[PDB]
C-alpha cells in the first residue's frame, strides 16, 4: 500500500490540478489488475497448464483461477469446458505491491526495454500490456524452468477517458516511452 | 407409372383450448385450460399442472384478467 499512500497524498492533488475536477471522487483510481496466461497448448498435457499456474502463483501470491473454453472451436481443437488458460485478479494491497514490483524491478529486467506504448488504453482508460517472458520477474528461478511462458497484464482503472489513465500512470511514473 | 411421396405424416389432435370460459362456475379440480406453455398463467385459487394445465383449487367463477408489467394473462377464481 506504499503506492496507495503515494496516490492518496500526491497523485490525487496532482490530477485534481491537471484536470480541474469539481470533486475528489471524480478523480480516477485503479481498481484491479488481471494477469492472464492463455495456455492453448495444455490440451496436449495438463502439466503445461499445471506448471504455468505454479509459476504465476509465485509472481502474485494468489492461486490462479484456471479458465476454460467459453465455447467450442475446431480450429483450436477445443470443446466447451477444456481448461485452456489461467487468470489472477489482483486488488487492494497485493495490487499495489505487484504494481510496485512491476515498475521498479520487472520492467528494467525486460530484454531491450525501450518504453511502453501509450496506445494501449482500450479507449476507456483501462490499460493492457503483454510480456514475452516470465523470467523478468525474480520470483521465477532461471534454472528451474525449461519453457518460456508468456502472460498479459490488464490494468482496469476507473478513468473514463484514455488520457485520465495516461496521466494517472504518468503520476505513477509509468514508463510509457 | 412412377412416383412417390414423403409428406404423409401427421399427429393426433390433442384437444387443447379453454374448457371453461369466463363467468362460468366450476368445481374444485375442474380443468379450466389445457395448453402447451404458459400462454395463460395461474392466479388466485388456480393451480398449474405438470403440463401447464390450469385447474381450479377451489369452487367458484372463472375470472380472466391481464396483469403484470408484461401484460401476461392470469386466470383467477372468484368465490361462490
Amino acid at each position: 500500500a506504499k503506492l496507495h499512500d503515494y496516490y492518496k497524498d500526491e497523485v490525487v492533488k496532482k490530477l485534481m490540478t491537471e484536470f480541474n475536477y469539481n470533486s475528489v471522487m471524480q478523480v480516477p483510481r485503479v481498481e484491479k489488475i488481471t494477469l492472464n496466461m492463455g495456455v492453448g497448448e495444455a490440451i496436449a498435457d495438463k502439466k503445461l497448464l499445471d506448471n504455468a499456474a505454479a509459476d504465476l502463483a509465485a509472481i502474485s501470491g494468489q492461486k490462479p483461477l484456471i479458465t476454460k473454453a467459453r465455447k467450442s472451436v475446431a480450429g483450436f481443437k477445443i470443446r466447451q469446458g477444456y481448461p485452456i488458460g489461467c487468470k489472477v485478479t489482483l486488488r487492494g494491497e497485493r495490487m499495489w505491491e505487484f504494481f510496485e514490483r512491476l515498475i521498479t524491478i520487472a520492467v528494467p529486467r525486460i530484454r531491450d526495454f525501450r518504453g511502453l506504448s501509450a496506445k494501449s488504453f482500450d479507449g476507456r482508460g483501462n490499460y493492457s500490456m503483454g510480456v514475452r517472458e516470465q523470467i523478468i520477474f525474480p520470483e521465477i528461478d532461471y534454472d528451474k524452468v525449461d519453457r518460456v511462458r508468456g502472460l498479459d497484464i490488464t490494468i482496469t482503472t476507473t478513468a473514463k477517458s484514455d488520457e485520465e489513465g495516461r496521466a494517472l500512470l504518468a503520476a505513477f511514473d509509468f514508463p510509457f516511452r | 407409372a412412377g412416383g412417390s411421396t414423403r409428406n404423409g405424416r401427421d399427429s393426433e389432435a390433442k384437444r387443447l383450448g379453454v374448457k371453461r370460459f369466463g363467468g362460468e362456475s366450476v368445481l374444485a379440480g375442474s380443468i379450466i385450460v389445457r395448453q402447451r406453455g404458459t400462454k395463460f398463467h395461474a392466479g388466485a385459487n388456480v393451480g398449474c399442472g405438470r403440463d401447464h394445465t390450469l385447474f381450479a383449487k377451489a369452487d367458484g367463477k372463472v375470472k380472466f384478467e391481464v396483469k403484470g408489467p408484461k401484460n401476461r394473462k392470469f386466470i383467477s377464481i372468484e368465490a361462490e
Binding site: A58, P108, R109, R114, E139, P175 | -
Partner: protein, 66 residues
C-alpha cells in the same frame, strides 16, 4: 483471502547496484540482489543516447580534407 491454497507472501529486501534498498512482499523468501532498478535503468540517459543515426556527409568530410 483463503487460508491454505495460497503461497507464502512475506516481506523481503531487494537491494540494487545503485544501492536502492527496497523492501517488498514476495514469494521468494530469501533476500534479493538486483542488477538494475528503475532508479538506475538507462531509460533516462541511455535510451537518449541509443538512437545514434550519424551523418553520411559528416563521415565523408571526416575521413579527409580537400
Amino acid at each position: 483471502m483463503k487460508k491454505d491454497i495460497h503461497p507464502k507472501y512475506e516481506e523481503i529486501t531487494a537491494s540494487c547496484s545503485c544501492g536502492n534498498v527496497m523492501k517488498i512482499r514476495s514469494t521468494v523468501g530469501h533476500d534479493l540482489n538486483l542488477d538494475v532498478c528503475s532508479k538506475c535503468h538507462p531509460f533516462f540517459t541511455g535510451k537518449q543516447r541509443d538512437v545514434a543515426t550519424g551523418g553520411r556527409v559528416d563521415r565523408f568530410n571526416k575521413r579527409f580534407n580537400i
